[PDB]
Amino acid sequence: GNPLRKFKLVFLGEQSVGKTSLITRFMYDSFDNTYQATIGIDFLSKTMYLEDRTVRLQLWDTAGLERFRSLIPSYIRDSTVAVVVYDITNLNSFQQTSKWIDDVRTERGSDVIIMLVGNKTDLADKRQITIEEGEQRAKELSVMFIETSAKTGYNVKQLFRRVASALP
Amino acid sequence: RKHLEEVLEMKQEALLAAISEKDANIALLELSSSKKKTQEEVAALKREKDRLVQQLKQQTQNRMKLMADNY
Ligand SMILES: Nc1nc2c(ncn2[C@@H]2O[C@H](COP(=O)(O)OP(=O)(O)OP(=O)(O)O)[C@@H](O)[C@H]2O)c(=O)[nH]1
Ligand SMILES: [Mg+2]
User: Fold this and answer.
1) Alpha-carbon span B33 to A121, nearest angstrom
2) What is the DSSP string of B7-22?
3) Which residue of A has its CA nearest to B32?
4) Fewer CB near the last or first residue (10 Å), C or N of chain A?
5) Which domain, by its residues, includes B31?
6) CA A30 remoteness from chain centre
7) B36-67 and B2-31 are packed helices; what angle lies between their axes, rounded to 10 degrees?
């Protein structure tokens, strides 16, 4: 009965941080233990219902493997939302989110919503970045922030709900 | 090479919009899919969406093959 709008979300981050696993958990309420790297870019979608609005979330799931890197600016430009993912056990993946976010702004400027995601919170014994450092980095780059575990499902639904509530 | 890149970019842009609009149309019909006729249209649009997504993947492989040449 409500108006329906589409919004495209691009998932960005170093290889193996869990971009696809977050999507698989949201789309299929499942988790795959065996790593299957994304070859190029994949498309998935889901409808979300909100008070007085319906949104069709369209997801560009991009590869972290370096050979596909030059294909990614096209999908950033195509998207109004960027989900930049790192791995809380992997300091380099966190540092690189500054580069990912800078590339988003190269393609979109301020005309974009950015969610920084620290994934794999279930690997608590191997954590290399505190939740505080992630929260402060996001505030410094003026982006949203959340920590998740695609493996346990922790905060995965909240990630997409918070993004959907931020849309126009 | 810069010229080939402009050509491939424009073709991909057409394809991304077609995928997104095909998917948007699926989402619209799914809202009120309370009929045998509606799910049949939904099934057909889903076939068309998969076909477009498959074209994009193949265009992507072609794009990387043509970038790996000498200019
Ligand atoms: N413990 C734990 N492992 C995870 C989690 N998320 C992903 N993994 C594992 O990490 C590996 C990489 O996951 P992917 O979802 O394929 O990562 P990706 O970012 O999509 O990787 P690329 O597409 O190659 O860029 C897989 O083995 C997953 O099972 C998580 O939340 N917790
Ligand atoms: Mg992936």
Assistant:
1) 39
2) HHHHHHHHHHHHHHHH
3) A1
4) N
5) 2-67
6) 17
7) 170
Closest CA to A95 of A63, A58, A141, A40: A141
Task: State whether the beta carbon of A16 lies less than 6 angstroms from ligand 1.
Answer: yes
Q: Which amino acid is at A43?
A: F
Size of interface A-B (CB pairs under 8 A): 46
Closest approach of B27 to chain A, Cα-based (Å): 7
Tokens read off for B31:
């809202």
Per-domain residue ranges for chain A? 4-166
Residue A63 CB–ligand 1 contact under 6 Å: yes
* CA A43-A44-A49 angle, 5° bins: 145
Q: Does residue B14 come out as left (phi exceeding 0), alpha (psi in the -120 to 50 range) or beta?
A: alpha
Angle between helical axes of A156-165 and A19-28 (0-180°, round to 10) = 90
- The number of folded domains in chain B is 1
Determination approach: X-ray
Query: Å resolution of this model?
Result: 2.0
Identify the residue whose tokens are 């492989």: B61
Torsion of CA A18, A21, A22, A25, to 10 degrees: -160
